[PDB]
Design a protein around this ligand. Structure first.
Ligand SMILES: OC[C@H]1O[C@@H](O[C@H]2[C@H](O)[C@@H](O)[C@H](O[C@H]3[C@H](O)[C@@H](O)[C@H](O)O[C@@H]3CO)O[C@@H]2CO)[C@H](O)[C@@H](O)[C@@H]1O
Ligand SMILES: OC[C@H]1O[C@@H](O[C@H]2[C@H](O)[C@@H](O)[C@H](O[C@H]3[C@H](O)[C@@H](O)[C@H](O)O[C@@H]3CO)O[C@@H]2CO)[C@H](O)[C@@H](O)[C@@H]1O
Length: 430
């Protein structure tokens, strides 16, 4: 899909820092871009190629939708989407009201120049960030993660898209982004079915698949550290039958891990470790440094200067430790009562061969129509409960309801900042 010129594209700048050794790094004058699903699509004589949850008569097929339509700069990222950067801090607003619309959650990808998002060599180094989710309530996911999208935006891989990373095209994770309106520069209009609760969404035929490492899926009641690996980690397209994820009737259908191997302290048997008032106090802002080693992913916090280690798990027959190692991913499933995709798609070796694939840093805040963040902040699937693995937070299973938590605390915000990247133990000294 080409680009439309009714709106110029202006990426807020977001400073991060490249480290070499402790108490010494190097800043990074970066910028930021919003995922391409939030912009406007039209044709030459102006009018939507996609209005609301449905496509338009203007469009007819995967191909002629890319040679006919185009995407647009985001207008003012602040007033239209709650987007707002301040030096090193990227604020993101959950519920934003404007003249004639209503943006709901968004996605942002660290850049390198207005043409390229910034690629990331994880395996052997670590990533850290300050985060203030203190008003991110039950049902919202204020997210920070890596998903191997392409460098330029997939523009050379699929030149039907001449917008490229320039306009947030190209998003892919490990659930096959079936919701995107374009994947591999083709429009997902053919057979596009509209959402049943999301007035802005729909699920497409093609999804955008690749690997995903979920350093931080959360809000102030619980967090989760979840990598996910694929039979091919790199960007890649699934086709209807060969699509799994939330968006296809067969979750584990395709080449990827949609569940991956999480570590949620609460889920692992420690209730009182993370929240408002807990050891890790989420009422206040903190530091989450996280590491990448073959067969090991470590993640520690810094609150009020102090190092805070996450508690090892509790239940019998689980590893002694908190680290995401293949002993975990193995054992996790001998008692957590869940389908082991992890071993299916390659086990922790395949993830390590995923830890070496070029990645890009997404920061985000969203609510989830298919499960109301049930899987993150409480007991899910809320079909019995009282088993190992179901309780995953301190939220009642009433919450997360899209419309509802959109009305209860619509000032909710995540605040992303003070990013640090480099070899293991460079970003801090704990
Ligand atoms: O001008 C076009 C409209 O874009 C709106 O953005 C919505 C997008 O249409 C939609 O693709 C995006 O989908 C999100 C979804 O909100 C979220 O629940 C899910 O977790 O991720 C999806 C990824 O596609 O929703 C946004 C939210 O609005 C603008 O907000 C709107 O002003 C504008 O009319
Ligand atoms: O943040 C990026 C992506 O998040 C995805 O959320 C998935 C989580 O990564 C995963 O931990 C969770 O696993 C659930 C599984 O859905 C469910 O079948 C089972 O009962 O509980 C598992 C954990 O115990 O899956 C969610 C999706 O439901 C988004 O799916 C993805 O679109 C987004 O980019």
């Amino acid at each position: 899909q080409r680009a439309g010129n009714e709106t110029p594209e202006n990426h807020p700048p977001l400073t991060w820092q490249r480290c070499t050794a402790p108490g010494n790094c190097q800043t990074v004058n970066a910028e930021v871009v919003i995922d391409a699903n939030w912009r406007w699509l039209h044709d030459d004589n102006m009018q939507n190629c996609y209005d609301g949850n449905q496509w338009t008569n203007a469009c007819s097929t995967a191909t002629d939708c890319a040679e006919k339509c185009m995407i647009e700069g985001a207008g003012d990222y602040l007033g239209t989407y709650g987007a707002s950067t301040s030096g090193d801090a990227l604020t993101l607003k959950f519920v934003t009201k404007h003249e004639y619309g209503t943006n709901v959650g968004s996605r942002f990808y660290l850049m390198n120049g207005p043409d390229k998002y910034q690629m990331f060599n994880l395996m052997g180094n670590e990533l850290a960030f300050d985060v203030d989710l203190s008003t991110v309530e039950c049902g919202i996911n204020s997210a920070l993660y890596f998903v191997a999208m392409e460098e330029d935006g997939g523009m050379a891989s699929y030149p039907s898209n001449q917008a490229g990373a320039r306009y947030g095209t190209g998003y892919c994770d490990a659930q096959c982004a079936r919701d995107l309106k374009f994947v591999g520069g083709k429009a997902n209009i053919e057979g596009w079915k509209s959402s049943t609760s999301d007035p802005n969404a729909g699920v497409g035929p093609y999804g955008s698949c690749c690997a995903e490492i979920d350093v931080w899926e959360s809000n102030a009641y619980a967090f989760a550290f979840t990598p996910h690996a694929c039979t091919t980690n790199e960007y890649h397209v699934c086709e209807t039958t060969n699509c799994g994820g939330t968006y296809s009737e067969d979750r584990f259908a395709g080449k990827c891990d949609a569940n991956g191997c999480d570590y949620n302290p609460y889920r692992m048997g420690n209730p009182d470790f993370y929240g408002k008032g807990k050891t890790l106090d989420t009422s206040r802002k903190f530091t989450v440094v996280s590491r990448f080693e073959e067969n090991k992913l470590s993640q520690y916090f810094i609150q009020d200067g102090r190092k805070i280690e996450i508690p090892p798990p509790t239940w019998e027959g689980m590893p002694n430790s908190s680290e995401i190692t293949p002993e975990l991913c193995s054992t996790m499933f001998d008692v957590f009562n869940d389908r082991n995709r992890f071993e299916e798609v390659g086990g922790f070796e395949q993830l390590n061969n995923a830890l070496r694939v070029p990645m890009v840093l997404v920061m985000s805040i969203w609510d989830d129509h298919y499960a109301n963040m049930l899987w993150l902040d409480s007991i899910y699937p809320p079909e019995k409960e009282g088993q190992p693995g179901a309780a995953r937070g301190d939220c009642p299973t009433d919450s997360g309801v899209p419309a509802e938590v959109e009305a209860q605390f619509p000032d909710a915000q995540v605040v992303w900042s003070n990013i640090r990247f480099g070899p293991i133990g460079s970003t801090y000294d704990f």
